[PDB]
């Protein structure tokens, strides 16, 4: 599907990959991480990334960017609903 760019925020990185994974319906952290690390070589090389990855999602859920109904382990859903040119 849509190729992932580079040098985005960890939030934007997921926001780009999410719609690709299951049409942005949602994907497990392993699936997402594997995808993010694969499409973004910088996060692939970075071992510390994986922690920041979890931190990014944590920031996303309050932001309404991503939603994680299960919790830490579960499935990251591309919410991206509280922003859609609603005017």
What would you say this structure looks like, in words?
The PDB classes it as dna binding protein. Keywords: Winged-helix, DNA binding protein. It forms a monomeric assembly. The entry is titled "Engineering the structural stability and functional properties of the GI domain into the intrinsically unfolded GII domain of the yeast linker histone Hho1p". The protein: Histone H1. The organism is Saccharomyces cerevisiae. There is one protein chain. With 87 residues, the chain is mainly α. It has one domain: Winged helix-like DNA-binding domain superfamily/Winged helix DNA-binding domain (Arc Repressor Mutant, subunit A), CATH 1.10.10.10. It is 45% helix and 5% strand. Strands 1-2 form a two-stranded antiparallel sheet. The chain is globular, with a radius of gyration of 12 Å.
Quick recap of the structure?
The protein is mainly alpha-helical and 87 residues long.
Write the layout of secondary structure elements.
Elements (H helix, E strand, L loop, with lengths): L9 H8 L11 H11 L1 H5 L3 H15 L2 E2 L9 E2 L9
Antiparallel strand pairs: 1-2
PDB class: dna binding protein
Keywords: Winged-helix, DNA binding protein
Assembly: monomeric
